[PDB]
A paper describes a structure:
The simplest TCSs comprise a sensory histidine kinase (HK) and a response regulator (RR) component. To address this question we have used the TCS [name]-[name] from [name] as a model. We had previously shown that the HK [name], a member of the HisKA_3 family, undergoes important conformational changes to switch between phosphatase- and phosphotransfer-competent states.
One using the phosphatase-constitutive mutant DesKCSTAB, and the other with DesKCH188E carrying a phosphomimetic substitution, both in complex with the REC domain of [name]. (D) Cartoon representation of the DesKCH188E:[name]-REC (phosphotransferase) complex, along two orthogonal views (left and right subpanels). Note best fitting with a one dimer DesKCH188E (chains AB) to one monomer [name]-REC (chain C) model. The β4α4 loop in [name] plays a key role in these controls, remodeling its configuration in concert with [name]-association. Our model predicts an important role of the highly conserved Thr80(RR) in stabilizing an intermediary metaphosphate group, ideally positioned to accompany the migrating phosphoryl moiety. Phosphotransfer thus results in a fully activated RR configuration, with a closed phosphate lid that ensures the release of a stable P~[name] species, as observed in active free RR structures.
Residue numbers in the entry:
A (entry chain C): 0 to 131
B (entry chain B): 154 to 239, 243 to 327, 332 to 367
C (entry chain A): 155 to 331, 335 to 368
Amino acid sequence: SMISIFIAEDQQMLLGALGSLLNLEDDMEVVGKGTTGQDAVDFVKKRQPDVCIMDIEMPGKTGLEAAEELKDTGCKIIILTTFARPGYFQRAIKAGVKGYLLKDSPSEELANAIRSVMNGKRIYAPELMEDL
Amino acid sequence: RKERERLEEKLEDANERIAELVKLEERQRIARDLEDTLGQKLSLIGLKSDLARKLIYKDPEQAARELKSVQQTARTSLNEVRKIVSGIRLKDELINIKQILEAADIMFIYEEEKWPENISLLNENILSMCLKEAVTNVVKHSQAKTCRVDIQQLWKEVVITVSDDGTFKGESKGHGLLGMRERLEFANGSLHIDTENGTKLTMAIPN
Amino acid sequence: KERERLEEKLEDANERIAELVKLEERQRIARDLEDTLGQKLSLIGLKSDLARKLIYKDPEQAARELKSVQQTARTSLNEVRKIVSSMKGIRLKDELINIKQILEAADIMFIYEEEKWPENISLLNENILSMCLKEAVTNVVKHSQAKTCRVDIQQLWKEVVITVSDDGTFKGEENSFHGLLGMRERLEFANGSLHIDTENGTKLTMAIPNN
Ligand SMILES: Nc1ncnc2c1ncn2[C@@H]1O[C@H](COP(=O)(O)OP(=O)(O)CP(=O)(O)O)[C@@H](O)[C@H]1O
Ligand SMILES: Nc1ncnc2c1ncn2[C@@H]1O[C@H](COP(=O)(O)OP(=O)(O)CP(=O)(O)O)[C@@H](O)[C@H]1O
Ligand SMILES: [K+]
Ligand SMILES: [K+]
Ligand SMILES: [Mg+2]
Ligand SMILES: [Mg+2]
Ligand SMILES: [Mg+2]
């Protein structure tokens, strides 16, 4: 009924803003918040949320490294980034991320990607593909 | 004889080549500092703006709180883009006068390199004001085809000369010539004028 | 030793020389940026201020302004995305594509097989290598009369090593060091090296540090 979300984002202001933006949805719930890749691995393996919103660049373990450790859990991982760095896209796919979006994408589109991913779809931003 | 010049050129090019790499090394750095500052801040603005709009009616108090952060991160981010450099205002005036003279079909003769890098920010701002006025006078009155601006560090002064090849039209309180002289003299500087072959203003300020 | 204090003086001088070139750059970027982004950022602040001052008096207008803020931000982020990518220079993977096109257009067989691709190289050193790779291949096309060109790009120990070999004939004099000296100087600035073998055609070995 209600989609359980874990958010991993090292920048506290953004972490808080994302949680607030997603808690505004009727069919969604932020069940945990983290600032490192390890926080994501620990919560997802233990609490098993439906979805994990994962930042890439975080201290300790990156979101891509966290995504690799969670490749065979049943959690649907959506990556968020600001800049498309080379090979992040291929590493994301190979880790089995279900979504790869821009942080600054309108909030309506992030909630839509969470629903689409829960419906078995893979949502990749065209900007983040390494062909325009 | 000419091998002096041949080798001298070869040296300047090999030097200019190394410069490009240093430029590109600093450029590489600045881009990394932008993606870490501007990127995060612009991303945050969008999200908080989205949230603020979504709370207008639900919780206007929170929307206001969020809009305060949005205005703050924007002011700092603009302040952070200014914080890539420490500064020169006379270089900005140089750009203004080039535009003004070109728009007036007056040939502008100057050299970007000679521009003094050290003068107090106050004295730099006074010189900018005087440079603007000297050129406004060229445009409004001279009917010149050419305007020459010289900027030199001579002993304990910065000396700016503005010359034109038009004709002097003068024979006063509240106007530019006396205005510039009074402002310069208050700063222990000077303004001299020669109106024989067109008009030439020599303005000096301590440094 | 006195040789230490002289090298202190040589580093101090070289750094003083450098520090003025970096300030040239800072001043170029810092105006080109306050130019293109400066207005947009101030517009964001103003519209945020106005939207907060309207929230209760006219929430409909607040919302309208907030929609603007939202988009002004979104567009500036796209501007930065381009500025940032431009400033970073030519990627080695992209240069590899350029040289394949150039060699094919010149009817020169291109031999390359990915082996030990650099795991991480600085953007600077990557850009230097791109420039050198381009030039090595421009030289093959312009001078060699080769039918084949072999490019090897490998991370070996604490270096990235690029070799460009061709089966043509070397056309230069005893001392051919323009591009050859240009590449050597650029590489040496980066604490790298350029070596040349002109026996069986021309082979350039270029190395640059990388950990
Ligand atoms: N470069 C120049 N070429 C020709 N005539 C000039 C000149 N600079 C000044 N003059 C003459 O000197 C007069 C006085 O100059 P001044 O700058 O004090 O006043 P102004 O006429 O420019 C009004 P304001 O400076 O207040 O805008 C001008 O009106 C003009 O006759
Ligand atoms: N792959 C190659 N095969 C044959 N001759 C080569 C070669 N690479 C270089 N040379 C020879 O070495 C000379 C010097 O090369 P260099 O690259 O420094 O200058 P250049 O003639 O290419 C002009 P520039 O590099 O400034 O475009 C060439 O003119 C040519 O005689
Ligand atoms: K909810
Ligand atoms: K999985
Ligand atoms: Mg991060
Ligand atoms: Mg005047
Ligand atoms: Mg060449």
